Chains A and B, each alone.
With several copies, the nearest count.
Chain A
Amino acid sequence: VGALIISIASRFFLYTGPPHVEVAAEVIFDGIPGFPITNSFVVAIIIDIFVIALAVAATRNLQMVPRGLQNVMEFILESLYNLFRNINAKYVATAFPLVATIFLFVLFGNWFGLLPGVGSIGVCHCAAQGKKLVPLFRAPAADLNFTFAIAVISFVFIEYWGFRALGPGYLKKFFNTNGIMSFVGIIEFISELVKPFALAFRLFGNIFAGEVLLVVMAFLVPLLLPLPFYGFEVFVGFIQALIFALLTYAFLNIAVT
């Protein structure tokens, strides 16, 4: 294609308005007398349905020679299994399902955030009407509760497995050395304490920054300008999923050792 692109001035004809998407919390999807249904819980359930559907479609046959969707499903699992075998020797089977789920779920959550209608389709609670518009299908990782939940389950998993593998040694570390692990030990303890905060905040901030980047680049020029940033975002969603999986597995490996 030629570089003499003249459609870059489409903001005059198509103005998306100011970046109204600035909410740092959840918005209720449907009014239910029980617990509220957030904009992220509904897309979490949608991702659950999609993951279950692909899992049952790729394992309905259990063909010896994987082909089509079965090979696609098996390749990423083989890659993750080889990765965790490289990281640790005998703890791959103990932690593989949890890390694989916590990778795939956040992968599909970040990939859903780039889908059209995330920042546009919504429900009145619309500027012409008297009800303020709230967006629909807010990415689950943008919600803080989901990130805190995965961080705290990772912390529980690593602490429980370290304690089980090391007996009473992992419970109190080696604070009785008094020569070296007397000031390094408390630093390691506070690092472990703030590790779930870092793990949750990384994903939350990355996804929030990505979505506000999409909104701002739509605000500036909504034609052919945010394409490289959209490519970067669909790349960085998978990148952040792999980061979360690799970091939680490596933290488990360094805690058990």
Chain B
Amino acid sequence: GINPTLFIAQLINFLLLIFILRALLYRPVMNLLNERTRRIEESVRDAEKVR
């Protein structure tokens, strides 16, 4: 394929997919991982607080 119109169409398709996927599960999974590591750090801090 050489035509620039089809090339730009496929490029825009890829941009739409990356934008919808980054707002569908990437942000929830990143927030879940951040919450998990925050939970680990507060568990350590709370064990220190228990002592």
Contact = CB atoms under 8 A, between A and B. Distances in A.
A35 B11 CA distance: 14
Q: Which of A26, A52, A81, A145 has the most CB of B within 10 A?
A: A145
B50 interface: no
Interface of A: 25-26, 35-36, 38, 41, 44-45, 48, 51-52, 55-56, 58-59, 62, 64, 73-74, 77-78, 81, 93, 96-98, 100-102, 105, 143-146, 148-150, 152-153
**CB-CB nearest 8 A-B residue pairs:** A97-B22, A149-B11, A145-B1, A101-B18, A55-B25, A59-B25, A145-B7, A97-B26
Contacts of A98: 18, 22
Contacts of B22: 97-98, 101
B7 A52 contact: no
B24 A59 contact: yes
B44 interface: no
Contacts of A73: 25, 29
B10 A145 contact: yes
A64 B26 CA distance: 16
B21 A35 contact: no
Summarize A's interface: helix, strand, loop or mixed.
Answer: helix
Contacts of A25: 1
Q: Interface residue tally of chain B, by bracket? A: 20 to 34
B24 A35 contact: no
Summarize B's interface: helix, strand, loop or mixed.
Answer: helix
B21 A55 contact: yes
A102 B10 CA distance: 13
A248 B26 CA distance: 19
A37 to B, nearest CB: 10
Nearest to B23: A97
Contact of B14 (A52, A74, A105, A144): A105
Contact of B10 (A51, A97, A146): A146
B1 A26 contact: yes
A35 B8 CA distance: 11
B30 to A, nearest CB: 8
B11 A97 contact: no
A93 B29 CA distance: 12
